Symmetry: C2
């Protein structure tokens, strides 16, 4: 019943049930937690991963309404470092290695799952069904 | 500092920042509240209002992750009645009259605002900008 600090980062563009379940899972890794959520910057996301619909301000403002989210770092650093974990006193990083090998060697890696098919892009397809024909 | 029970209902299809701000506003109408959120059924919504993308189960499961939501009635009745307020001991109904005249006569109506332009349908337009040309 000591409080465990969990860090989860991501883009969190067009937040959907998949993101929410993953956040829920991080929050509940232990009985008593503080879930810190990192939100990646627009430039770094675009340069290193892919396009983003929503600004950093929009993606962060949305996460503020999520029950599981206790603290937000926005923008977060694109790569997690041992110094960053010390600075914010982070006990574990939650993510669904090569990059993460050092986190697992330190015992600070907690896996979470993805929920496929519940995404924002998947919803528009359902709207189209009422039409897609000849 | 006595606890005030607030009821807000709606479709909550493809939940977005607009819905979240409105829920936040209901939750914070008084210092100490229980926010009950009613989620309208698929059939009644379709018959009386318009199309819906997500099932009742999907719309309800999403609201479960929202910080401001304390209790959910799913499905909720399509029309609020004085008997329903008694049954769930509801002090105020929060909504953004003809229909609601009786609620205001009873002192049980609290207005909230809408946030236009932050909707799910408005996000797809931004994606299209990268293309819309000749
Ligand atoms: N969603 C991918 C990703 C990339 C970098 C980072 N720091 N976090 C997440
Ligand atoms: N969103 C409109 C609406 C219709 C009926 C009801 N009970 N609540 C909301």
């Amino acid at each position: 019943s000591k409080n465990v600090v969990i860090y989860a980062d991501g883009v969190y563009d067009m937040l959907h049930l998949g993101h929410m379940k993953q956040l829920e899972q991080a929050k509940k890794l232990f009985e008593n937690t503080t879930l810190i959520v990192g939100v990646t910057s627009d430039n770094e996301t675009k340069l290193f991963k892919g396009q983003v619909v929503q600004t950093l301000e929009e993606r962060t403002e949305t996460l503020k309404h999520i029950r599981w989210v206790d603290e937000i770092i926005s923008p977060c650093p694109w790569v997690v470092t041992p110094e960053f974990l010390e600075k914010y006193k982070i006990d574990y990083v939650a993510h669904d290695e090569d990059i993460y090998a050092w986190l697992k060697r330190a015992g600070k890696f907690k896996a979470t799952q993805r929920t496929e098919g519940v995404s924002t892009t998947d919803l528009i397809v359902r709207i189209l069904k009422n039409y897609e024909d000849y």
